[PDB]
Amino acid sequence: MALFAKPMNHKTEITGEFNGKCFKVVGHGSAPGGGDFRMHAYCESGTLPVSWCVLSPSIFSMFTKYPNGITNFFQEAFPEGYTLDRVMTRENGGSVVSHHSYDLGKDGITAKVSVKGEGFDPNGPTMTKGYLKVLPFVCHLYPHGAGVRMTSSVGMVKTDGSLDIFNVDSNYQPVGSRKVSVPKFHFVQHRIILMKDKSDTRDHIVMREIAVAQDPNEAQSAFRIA
Numbered sequence: 001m002a003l004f005a006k007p008m009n010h011k012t013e014i015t016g017e018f019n020g021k022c023f024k025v026v027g028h029g030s031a032p033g034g035g036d037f038r039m040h041a042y043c044e045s046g047t048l049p050v051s052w053c054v055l056s057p058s059i060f061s062m063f064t065k066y067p068n069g070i071t072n073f074f075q076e077a078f079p080e081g082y083t084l085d086r087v088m089t090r091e092n093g094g095s096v097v098s099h100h101s102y103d104l105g106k107d108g109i110t111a112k113v114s115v116k117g118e119g120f121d122p123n124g125p126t127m128t129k130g131y132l133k134v135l136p137f138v139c140h141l142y143p144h145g146a147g148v149r150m151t152s153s154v155g156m157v158k159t160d161g162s163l164d165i166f167n168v169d170s171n172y173q174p175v176g177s178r179k180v181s182v183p184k185f186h187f188v189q190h191r192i193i194l195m196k197d198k199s200d201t202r203d204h205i206v207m208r209e210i211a212v213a214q215d216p217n218e219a220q221s222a223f224r225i226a
Helices: 052-058
Strands: 008-018 021-033 036-043 082-090 095-105 108-118 131-134 137-144 147-158 163-174 186-195 204-214
Touching: 008 036, 008 052, 021 108, 052 095, 052 108, 052 131, 052 186, 052 204, 131 186, 137 163
Parallel strands: 008 108
Antiparallel strands: 008 021, 021 036, 036 204, 082 095, 082 163, 095 108, 131 147, 137 147, 137 186, 147 163, 186 204
C-alpha cells in the first residue's frame, strides 16, 4: 500500500476491566515512518486502575519497519485489515486477553480494543502501578494458516529493580477473503518507551515504540551457510 509509504495518524479506543475495575482509554498518535510510532493515551474514565506498562501492548503492527525480502503481513492485509487475538500471561500469576480490530480510512488507522485481566494480586505491581518499564524484546513470527502467530517473553521491571516475565501469544488473521501473502518465519525487535507529559494532568501515558522485522539467517554473515 502507498498509504503506508507516507506519514499516517492513528487512534484507539480501549475498553477494559482488570479484577472487575472498568476503564476506557483513548489515544491519538502518528506513524511518521521507519518503525517509530507514538501514541498519547489518557484514561477517559478517570484514574487507570492498572500499570500503564501492563496496558501498553493493548495501546498497530502495520507500523513495523520491514526490510525488502520479507512480506509485511500487517500492511498487506489492508485495505480489509486483520484482527489480533492475544493471550498474555504473567508467569507469577495473572492473565490478560484482548482483541483488536482496525479500520484504515482517510484520516489513518482507527483501532477498537477490548481487554480483560484477572488473577492479579490486589497488592501486586499490576494493580498498584509498581512497574517502571518494559525491557526490549524480540518476537518470533510464525506462519499460522492464512495469518501469523507472534510469541514473546517480555520482562517488566518493578520499582525495586526485580522483574516479572509476561508471555505474549498473538494470533493475527486477515479480515478480507482476498488471499494475503503469509511471510516466512522471522523476528521482530521491539522497544517501548513510556513518558508522562508534564502538561497533561489526566492519568495518561505517551508511548513510543520502535518495531523492526529481521531476517534470521541474514542477521550477520555468522548465520549465513550453504
